[PDB]
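Table S5 (text form). Sequence records supplied for joint modeling of the twelve-component complex.
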Amino acid sequence: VLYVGSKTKEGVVHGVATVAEKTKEQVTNVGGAVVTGVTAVAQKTVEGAGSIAAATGFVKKDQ
Amino acid sequence: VLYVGSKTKEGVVHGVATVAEKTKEQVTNVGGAVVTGVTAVAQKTVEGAGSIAAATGFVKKDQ
Amino acid sequence: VLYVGSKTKEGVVHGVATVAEKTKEQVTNVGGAVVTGVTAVAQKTVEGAGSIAAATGFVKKDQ
Amino acid sequence: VLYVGSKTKEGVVHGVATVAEKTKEQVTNVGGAVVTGVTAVAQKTVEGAGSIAAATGFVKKDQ
Amino acid sequence: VLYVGSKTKEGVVHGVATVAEKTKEQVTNVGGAVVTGVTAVAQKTVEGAGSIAAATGFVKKDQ
Amino acid sequence: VLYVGSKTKEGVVHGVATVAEKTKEQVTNVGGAVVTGVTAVAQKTVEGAGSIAAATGFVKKDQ
Amino acid sequence: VLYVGSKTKEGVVHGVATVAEKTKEQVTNVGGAVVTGVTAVAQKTVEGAGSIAAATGFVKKDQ
Amino acid sequence: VLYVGSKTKEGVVHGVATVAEKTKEQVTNVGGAVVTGVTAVAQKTVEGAGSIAAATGFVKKDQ
Amino acid sequence: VLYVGSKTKEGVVHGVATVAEKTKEQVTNVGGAVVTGVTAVAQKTVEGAGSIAAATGFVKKDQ
Amino acid sequence: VLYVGSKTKEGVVHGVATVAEKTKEQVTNVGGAVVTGVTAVAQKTVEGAGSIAAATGFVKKDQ
Amino acid sequence: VLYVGSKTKEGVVHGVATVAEKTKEQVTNVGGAVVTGVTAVAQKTVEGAGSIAAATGFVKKDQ
Amino acid sequence: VLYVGSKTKEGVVHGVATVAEKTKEQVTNVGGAVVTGVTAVAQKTVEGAGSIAAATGFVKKDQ
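The corresponding structure-token record, covering 756 residues in total, follows.
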């Protein structure tokens, strides 16, 4: 009768409606990174890092 | 009868309606990183970092 | 009667409706990386990193 | 009566409807990597990294 | 009565409907790698890495 | 009455309907690798890496 | 160049989002007529009568 | 160049999102007529009568 | 160049998303007529009457 | 160049997504007539009457 | 160059996705007539009457 | 160059996806007539009446 995990609900998306009417959508980049329009996204992570809609232009490194 | 996790609900999105009417949407970048329009996004993270809509132009490093 | 995992529901997406009417969608990049429009995406990760809609333009490395 | 895994439901997508009416969709890149439009994607990972909609333009390495 | 795996359901996609009406879809790249339109994709991975819709333009290596 | 694997269901896709009406679909690349349109794909992997819809343009190696 | 009907837009509903969270909805009548909850309703009528959400309990007639 | 019907748009519904979460919905009538919950309804009528969500309990007639 | 019907769009429904999560829906009537939940309904009528969601309990007639 | 019917679009439904999760749906009537849940219904009628979701309990007639 | 029927599109349904998850659906009537769940229905009628989802319990007649 | 029927498209259904997961569906009537679940139905009628999903319990007649 310990009930450590008796009911959990974590990282959950439910019941989403979405309408997008777009007469002209233009995404043109140079040298860069564009993220457009994610919907109903739901992750869980135990012991780690999570970047859902991430966008980097440059990543460098030295000694 | 300890009930450590008797009911949890954490990091949850539910019941979302969204309408977007866009006659012209133009996203044109150079050298950079644009994040546009995330919806109904729900993560959980145990022992880590989470940047949902992140955008960097430059990341460098030295000794 | 320990009930360690009596009921879990984690990293779940359910019940999503999506309508997209797009008369012209143009994604033309040079040198870069564009992520467009993910929907109803749900992962779980134990001991690791998860970037769902990630986009990088440059990744470098030195000593 | 330990019930370690009595009921789990993790990394699950269910009940998704999607309509996309696109009169013209043009994705033309040079040198780069474009990810367009994933839907109803659901992974699980034990001890590893998962990038669902990832896109890189350049990956380098040195000593 | 240990019940280690009494009921699990993990990495599952069920009940997806998708309609795509596309009068003209053109994907022409040079030097690069484009991923378009995956649907109802569901993997599981024990002790490994899984990138479902991944796209790289360049992968290099040095000493 | 140990029940280590009493019921598992992992990496499963079931109940998918998909309609695609495409008046003109043109995928012409040079030097690169395009993945278009996978549907109802479900793998499992014990002790290994799985990239379902992967696409690389260049893979190199040095000492 | 008369332009009798150059542009009309009449009886039009567009761009509506609605969320209803109802823990208990009970409609029990005797002898009568209940109309509950219409949304995004738009008619036009030339030479006639239109009652959109109408409800009558009794209608009689004599000589 | 008379342009009697150059552009008309009449009796039109477009771009509607609706979410309804109802834990218990009970409609039990005797002798009567209940209309519940119409959505995105759009008619046109030339020379006639239109009652979209109508509900009558009794209709009688005499000489 | 008369253009009597140059462009008409009348009685049209387009772009509707709807999510209904109902844990218990009970409709039990005696002697009567219940209409529940129509969606995305669009008629046109030239020279006649149109009742889309109509419900009558009794209809009588005499001399 | 009269153009009586140059472009008409009338009585049309297009682009509808619908998700219904119903744990228990019970419709039990006596003596009556229940209409439940029509979706994406679109008729046209020239010189006549159209009742799309109609429901009557009693219809009588005399001299 | 009269163009009486140059382009018509009337009574048309196109692009519909529908998901219905129903754990228990019970329709038990006595003496009556129940219509449940029509989808993507589109008729045209010239000189006549059309009742798509109609339901009557009693129809009588006298002199 | 009269073009009476230059292009017509009337009474047409195209591009429909439908998923129905039903753990228990029970339709048991006495004395009556139940219509359940028609999909993608499209008729045309010139000079006549069309009732697509019709259901009557009793039809009588007198002098």
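Note: Chain I has one domain: 1-63.
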